[PDB]
Amino acid sequence: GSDSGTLNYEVYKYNTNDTSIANDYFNKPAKYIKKNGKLYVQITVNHSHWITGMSIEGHKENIISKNTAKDERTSEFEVSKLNGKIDGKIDVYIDEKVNGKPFKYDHHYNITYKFNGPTDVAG
Ligand code: HEM
Ligand SMILES: [Cl-]
Ligand SMILES: [Zn+2]
Ligand SMILES: [Zn+2]
Numbered sequence: 157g158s159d160s161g162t163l164n165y166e167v168y169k170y171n172t173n174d175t176s177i178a179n180d181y182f183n184k185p186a187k188y189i190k191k192n193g194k195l196y197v198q199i200t201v202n203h204s205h206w207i208t209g210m211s212i213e214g215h216k217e218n219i220i221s222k223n224t225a226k227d228e229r230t231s232e233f234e235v236s237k238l239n240g241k242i243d244g245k246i247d248v249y250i251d252e253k254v255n256g257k258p259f260k261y262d263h264h265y266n267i268t269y270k271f272n273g274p275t276d277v278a279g
Contacts, residue, residue, distance in 0.1 A: 197271070242271065
């Protein structure tokens, strides 16, 4: 195997096998890195300015890069596995026009990640 690379994943509605409304805001694929004996994923979101916070498996995002022009950011999370489901949280805050009409949105959600990374890279 390889201790770094890309991995496919999907974001599911919490504790279901259904695609989350959140899923479109997550760029695919992510990357993974194994370092200091631990496993990490590096996930890029779009509409970054709408997503005020993220955590996975109880760990808050560590923002490693931002692209202000594309309204994207890349966040690193420690994970217990590269293949399988891990619950996470996302905070969303929107206050701007949608189709010309003011829209406001302020929610904190649970989500379930399904990671489809390699099975031969252990912690
Ligand atoms: C204009 C933008 C958006 C609209 C109109 C919208 C609308 C909705 C609606 C109607 C629900 C169902 C709530 C319920 O029935 O209780 C929902 C749930 C949800 N939304 Fe939002 N949403 C928007 C943006 C976002 C964004 C940017 C994210 C995250 C990046 C997000 C993440 C979620 C999550 C995680 C749920 C819970 C159910 C699921 O996982 O699909 N939404 N949204
Ligand atoms: Cl979490
Ligand atoms: Zn809030
Ligand atoms: Zn809410």
